[PDB]
Symmetry: D2
Subunit: 428 residues, 4 copies
Amino acid sequence: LPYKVADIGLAAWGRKALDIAENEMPGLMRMRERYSASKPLKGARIAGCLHMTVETAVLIETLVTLGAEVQWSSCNIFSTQDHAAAAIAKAGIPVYAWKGETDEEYLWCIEQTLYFKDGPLNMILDDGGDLTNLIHTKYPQLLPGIRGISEETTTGVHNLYKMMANGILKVPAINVNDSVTKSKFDNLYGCRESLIDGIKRATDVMIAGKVAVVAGYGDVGKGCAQALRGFGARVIITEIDPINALQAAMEGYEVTTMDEACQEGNIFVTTTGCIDIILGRHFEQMKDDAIVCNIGHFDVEIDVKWLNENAVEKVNIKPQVDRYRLKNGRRIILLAEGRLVNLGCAMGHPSFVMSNSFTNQVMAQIELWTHPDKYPVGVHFLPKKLDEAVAEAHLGKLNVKLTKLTEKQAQYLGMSCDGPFKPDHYRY
Amino acid sequence: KLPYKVADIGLAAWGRKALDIAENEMPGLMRMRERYSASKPLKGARIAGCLHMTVETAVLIETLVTLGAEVQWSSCNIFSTQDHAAAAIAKAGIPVYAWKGETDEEYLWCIEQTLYFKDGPLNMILDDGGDLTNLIHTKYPQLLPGIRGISEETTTGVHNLYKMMANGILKVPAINVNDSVTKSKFDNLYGCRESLIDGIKRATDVMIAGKVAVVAGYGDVGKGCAQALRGFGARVIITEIDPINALQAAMEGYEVTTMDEACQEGNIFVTTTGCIDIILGRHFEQMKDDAIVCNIGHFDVEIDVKWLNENAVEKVNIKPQVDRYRLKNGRRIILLAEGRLVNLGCAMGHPSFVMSNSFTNQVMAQIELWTHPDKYPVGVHFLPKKLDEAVAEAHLGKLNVKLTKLTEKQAQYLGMSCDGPFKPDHYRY
Amino acid sequence: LPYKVADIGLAAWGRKALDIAENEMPGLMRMRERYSASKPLKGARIAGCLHMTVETAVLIETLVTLGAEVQWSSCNIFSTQDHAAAAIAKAGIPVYAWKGETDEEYLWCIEQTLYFKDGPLNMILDDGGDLTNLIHTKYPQLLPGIRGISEETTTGVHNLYKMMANGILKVPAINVNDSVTKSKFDNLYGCRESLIDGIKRATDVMIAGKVAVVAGYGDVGKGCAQALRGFGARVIITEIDPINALQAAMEGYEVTTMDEACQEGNIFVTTTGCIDIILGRHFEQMKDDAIVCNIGHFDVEIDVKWLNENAVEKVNIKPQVDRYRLKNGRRIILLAEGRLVNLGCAMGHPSFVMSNSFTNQVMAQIELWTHPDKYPVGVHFLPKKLDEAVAEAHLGKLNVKLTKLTEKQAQYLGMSCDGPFKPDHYRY
Amino acid sequence: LPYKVADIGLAAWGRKALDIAENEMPGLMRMRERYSASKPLKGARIAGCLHMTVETAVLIETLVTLGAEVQWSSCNIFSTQDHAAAAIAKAGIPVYAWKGETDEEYLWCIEQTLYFKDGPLNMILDDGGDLTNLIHTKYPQLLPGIRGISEETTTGVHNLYKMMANGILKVPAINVNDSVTKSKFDNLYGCRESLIDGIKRATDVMIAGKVAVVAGYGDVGKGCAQALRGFGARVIITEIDPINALQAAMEGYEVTTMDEACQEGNIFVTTTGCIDIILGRHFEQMKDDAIVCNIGHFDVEIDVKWLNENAVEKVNIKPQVDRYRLKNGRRIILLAEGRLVNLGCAMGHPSFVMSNSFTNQVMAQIELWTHPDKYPVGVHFLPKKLDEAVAEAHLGKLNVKLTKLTEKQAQYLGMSCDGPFKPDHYRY
Ligand SMILES: NC(=O)c1ccc[n+]([C@@H]2O[C@H](COP(=O)([O-])OP(=O)(O)OC[C@H]3O[C@@H](n4cnc5c(N)ncnc54)[C@H](O)[C@@H]3O)[C@@H](O)[C@H]2O)c1
Ligand SMILES: NC(=O)c1ccc[n+]([C@@H]2O[C@H](COP(=O)([O-])OP(=O)(O)OC[C@H]3O[C@@H](n4cnc5c(N)ncnc54)[C@H](O)[C@@H]3O)[C@@H](O)[C@H]2O)c1
Ligand SMILES: NC(=O)c1ccc[n+]([C@@H]2O[C@H](COP(=O)([O-])OP(=O)(O)OC[C@H]3O[C@@H](n4cnc5c(N)ncnc54)[C@H](O)[C@@H]3O)[C@@H](O)[C@H]2O)c1
Ligand SMILES: NC(=O)c1ccc[n+]([C@@H]2O[C@H](COP(=O)([O-])OP(=O)(O)OC[C@H]3O[C@@H](n4cnc5c(N)ncnc54)[C@H](O)[C@@H]3O)[C@@H](O)[C@H]2O)c1
Ligand SMILES: O=C(Nc1ccc2nc(N3CCOCC3)sc2c1)c1ccc(CN2C(=O)C=NC2=O)cc1
Ligand SMILES: O=C(Nc1ccc2nc(N3CCOCC3)sc2c1)c1ccc(CN2C(=O)C=NC2=O)cc1
Ligand SMILES: O=C(Nc1ccc2nc(N3CCOCC3)sc2c1)c1ccc(CN2C(=O)C=NC2=O)cc1
Ligand SMILES: O=C(Nc1ccc2nc(N3CCOCC3)sc2c1)c1ccc(CN2C(=O)C=NC2=O)cc1
């Protein structure tokens, strides 16, 4: 089996989508402009485990343009876009991914990416840690032949630190999740674009003139709060961290508890990454047809089980939109069954966000592959200069003219005119 | 003869579900039910309505019925009906003649069925766009003495009403509700603010932040569009022919220049002028690759779509109402809704709460015309300010707004009534 | 007497401040550019009565440039800037004004302006209606030889409408006050600009993170609320008009009563134009060191008398800043003794704001004088095409490039390509 | 000599200002609430070198309230508010500082703080490193008796790493400058409040409708841009960092070069911390009466020397406001001679900002004095849990209600419910 896709005939529709996405992903296209001649990944045999979307197809074809051998599988059973996968298969690349895999087929799809034309993998590009854990626990014989790992997920990086503390990790790993360019686009800018899009497709509701309660004021909360405020909603924040709580107050947001705010809100958005945020006792105080949704962590934040078990009516309105009637006579509108509203009720992040994340991945691959004896086994942050480079790559598309330091200004500032321009502890 | 005519009356239960959701978002119409269902002030009325047969309009329809009126209904556009909403109205025993995908002949037919009731011909006209008003004057001028009032809510329709008075054709009193504060601001500003981006997003899924968005026009639509784009992190450039409107944009920090200049800078183009020849061939040729171009102003006149069709070397349809043209220079143009209204072509229009402000405006006008025959001679009138205010007050509860009441002493000082109106007719808000 | 000033040897300083203020008043300078050669006012003896400031000094010299004889007095006792007064006296213009006049001297100064070198006044330019009221009641002989009045005050136009209601107005007038370009700048943009300057100079207080309660959401309220919000304050609104209240809600502001909001606010700002807004029972509920000020109508909005009568301490911190201690042991910081904070604690509106108000005046003078057989004896709004021309005059300074309607476009729209562009009911 | 102040008779005025400041400095009043009974600084002989302002005077009396003996001097010759220094003098606290000191007097004043009644100092509270530099060079005898150093300045902290690298630092030190609660208030929020205050007092110019060029988009630039945008100015950013350039772009600011931007701007503000930002080449292109000022680094950013050397006129308008006429006949308005505009033309940061920086200082002292063993000789960041504590201390004043994690939630998140809540790399 050279690949496995749902329908190869969808390749043409995929290529048209790719062509449109390329123009919103200038960071990846910049890497093609810079590195297509020199091919810094010639020799590399990269196994990738990452959502097989249109955006990811741009990543895959960028890596190939840089000289690498690439074989791919999706890191989720439902997230694949079949036409994107088809387009990649038609271009010769071994890709094992389709929408609605079984749990057995998911494991099998990863298995087909380990050995290549010219022997086993020597690089891992990862999103969730599933490819990394499969090698270590099942195929540890292959570990010495692997030069490096890239990982861009919070779960995956926590897992990498765990493997290092337990002495299990045997390959140097670059964490790109904590890049400024990755984190700000994935957490803040991304959710700022897509939140209200999810709410609108689901409900078509008037945002302006409503009280909106956002639980959490981290990067995701900041983003959501800014989007809602922009439409003319009155935004109330809840926070546990007094620093984040202070930030909110300094922008003019009311900051209070969910115990208080549940009587106020017309819309509730959870962004905490934490369990037990919206509970039965909160639901019972809510205004009629209050909209409740999550954009934070999987499905743990809203007590959905409570609604199923305590409501008198549950009525499906349209896909991923349920309207529960309670014992008190009032209604709750739940979106995406408590799951991520931006993926359940909308299309997730825009292409431009994904460009920042995936450009970080490309940087990490080059850095590990081109500099073998520069990273010992262990989890490493992406160097700042490469993080800056990711940002630089996107400035052209953003109509931005960057100023260059003069030799004299550099000397005064005690930094190189090429970077990095900030110390490692700098918060931006 | 036919008691109603609609695509599929089996969709009525789905209709009722949508009505129930939207009723909560339409407190204006629902407060009308609260205070006038007892007294039934439209009793003995027989209202022929011509208005898009939607969920919102269904709530309008039933509010008219709740207040004692007899109602018969047709849509004012051939594609704008929601069949489930029309089914729900048909299941409730109301003569509705409407479906999505009508012929120009079926459209005319649908309106003709609403003129005669069992107890006699129409008493009142509720209109959007003038077509019901135009049919009775052209073709059924016998009925004109029987008709007590007209409500009209469209710019097109109000202009037409003023043209008919100038020539002495209009034989019925009419209330222009289009120029109400509560109507104009919701329909022009707040509505477009909410739905522009919904249109753009559903069509393209594009990142709005970090883009130059060129907004032609800074009227109320323009102001809303500009504000919406700005809030996403787009750099909004504006074009204007009116120095006051141009000055307003400058005072909010927007760059104001010409389309001749701005066509080189913009990633997104949005027309809001209500005027022809806004975006043109010479502009298209200057644009960046994959410049998203759309319209939220007047029907399809603002963008020269005919130019694109005649001059592009490729035209590929990406999805419904989204076309990607390739030009002779090898660069591409993404056009939304074929130059038609992007918020209605690529999304579902305005939210229920916007529509509530407009439709409560209609209900106010009807009661006023029916209850007070001697008060309005033949001609075009604005809705009185005190009724405009009542529309706004009817939505304050929903908005968690506690309104202050003037003390007797304060009202004497200010020289107004404590119940209003609170502003003179020239006041601009 | 040719003039009367405090010190005519302050004219160097005056001319310097004029030269600065001319650049920020392009509306008046555009009038000099268009009209200095044609002198449309040639034969106009204009008797003015308006605050004798650097700003107004520019207006005075623009009228002269446009070919008019002009004689001036101040419409207020304290508002005259003496260096500006000096400079106008030096250029051979009869100006009778200084800072700290008596009520008797005030009436005398205005009486001197009525009689020119060549006879009685041809025109009236007025702010507050005092010059208009003087000639009707005290000098009824001069009415037939005066072609028109320009008025730019809420006070003044109401008095003009009262005079016309009762039949004691024998000369036609232009109401400039309800021009878009006057109203927006004087009410909205000006107060947005100068409220916070007023508060800061008085207190130096942090705005961000405070609850700021703004009574009234008219043009002043909107200005004040937008400014406070921009600094990161949580703005609460009070209103009696449901339309205005709806507007505030649609921008995300909380809207509640003063009876409720007095327990919340760190800063109170009154803009209603109405009596009995902030009262003793509101003062008793306020947080410690609540700042209370007025930017609306004179001194009727806040019950300052109550504080004087009921406080246990009254300390002056600095000029126009009083700190009261109440029986409950809590403190109130009152700005400007309940007078206008922007004029009491700061310099009032910027020059650019004033340029829009006075260019409206200049237009009114040209319109009445150049068209005698057009305006019959009454109160009129400045024509829209002239309101438009005020705005146009400032666009150059704003770096604005105005589009011109092609003839084909103007036909479609059924208007002229020179205007007016909007109907008379249009609200902007 | 017990103290040396300009005039002790200004202490009733000072106490009055002190009483106002206290209510805006909840951080320091919360430290007085918690620790006034326990007396954690009991025994501590603190020598502080820091601007002798009303704000600092609260910090001083907070340290005394915590059971410390404190001797004080200013860290700048002009920054003392004499009336504040008199209040601290009358409270019986040895303070040696006045407005307008000589460089020999400045030194003298710091030398008077080293020696108390009971003996020599145990602790150093510092701003700019001049107390710390004096003792190591000129009083190394006192080094072993000194338990800890607090320091809150970029200059002062860069200096500790220069000392530590060369083995001369022989006292443990806490860097408080890079705390979240210090950095955000001193840099971003502070300048957001005070920039425009500076420009207004100097010029009274309309901000709305103008192009404003902000050089730099760091914390200072971010604040300055946000403030200008809030008034209705069109803001243009210049940047050398692609990440910060990207951040500006994502909020809809234009990002171009000064070489291009100099032809556009009505207002210019420099925030880079870098030399050669505004130059003669730029000045020659500027619009007539461009307002140019600096809020970044001292007087290096704007080539003020060029203006003095190449302009045909230089005219003082008022203190710290100079208006040059250039060879091309156009005018430039320089503010504060290119020095910090917020301190040159206004009062600097509000009391509430300063509360965050000086509460950091209190936290630093307790942590050093009560835990000597914990800190080896070196430069240490302030621990996060204390940074959090600073923020928590201000929430009460802000009307903020912080949520507390349940035991179950804390367990799920792998953190204590008392904190810290974020890892050390977290950027807020
Ligand atoms: N939906 C998406 O597409 C998407 C995108 C990026 C990240 N995320 C996820 O969203 C979550 C948040 O990400 P982030 O970057 O904002 O994290 P963050 O650490 O920046 O912010 C989370 C905030 O929630 C607060 N918090 C924790 N428990 C709380 C409680 N019980 N009540 C109130 N506040 C509480 C914390 O103080 C913290 O400030 C994560 O789980 C992340 O994986 C989702
Ligand atoms: N999409 C929708 O659902 C929807 C909703 C409401 C209104 N509208 C329509 O939108 C249009 C605009 O409505 P409005 O209330 O903002 O009108 P408006 O009069 O308030 O504003 C239109 C503006 O366009 C400007 N303009 C005209 N020609 C121009 C040109 N060639 N270049 C630049 N500017 C120009 C005018 O100066 C004016 O300020 C109307 O056709 C209206 O019917 C659409
Ligand atoms: N400070 C200045 O230099 C300056 C500048 C311009 C205007 N003004 C003055 O400020 C005042 C307001 O001007 P405006 O143009 O906003 O008038 P406006 O009529 O547009 O607005 C006043 C608002 O106050 C509301 N109001 C009245 N009584 C109220 C009450 N008891 N509680 C709450 N709201 C109440 C009204 O509903 C109205 O919307 C006027 O007196 C005007 O003369 C002052
Ligand atoms: N006036 C005040 O009260 C006050 C308060 C705090 C800090 N500061 C000072 O302000 C300055 C900046 O502080 P910060 O916290 O913003 O530092 P920062 O590092 O966060 O910001 C400085 C920014 O300027 C940019 N920059 C450097 N050289 C440049 C050039 N030639 N052109 C354009 N941009 C350039 C950098 O990319 C950087 O992002 C420092 O000198 C600091 O001491 C002043
Ligand atoms: O995880 C992702 N998508 C996902 C997974 C499961 C799922 N299950 C659903 N339902 C279906 C109806 O029945 C109930 C369960 S919807 C759904 C969506 C996912 C994450 C990041 C990117 C990254 N990304 C973008 O955001 C845009 N391009 C990208 O690559 C994609 C998908
Ligand atoms: O007009 C509406 N809708 C519409 C949709 C498609 C369409 N397609 C057309 N054709 C043209 C000829 O070529 C082919 C395509 S015309 C047309 C019209 C419409 C307006 C107001 C409200 C009012 N409204 C809201 O906005 C929300 N609820 C409402 O009732 C509805 C629909
Ligand atoms: O009315 C104006 N100024 C004014 C009047 C009286 C007054 N009384 C005071 N106190 C002092 C202490 O004892 C008690 C009385 S302070 C004060 C200030 C006034 C209005 C518009 C413009 C128009 N204007 C601007 O706003 C800017 N340039 C202008 O021309 C000016 C002043
Ligand atoms: O350095 C400070 N202020 C200062 C220094 C010198 C100076 N020189 C001037 N001119 C005068 C006319 O001739 C030319 C020289 S004005 C001026 C002002 C300084 C810093 C932080 C805080 C800390 N701070 C605040 O920011 C607010 N409260 C505070 O404690 C204070 C002052």
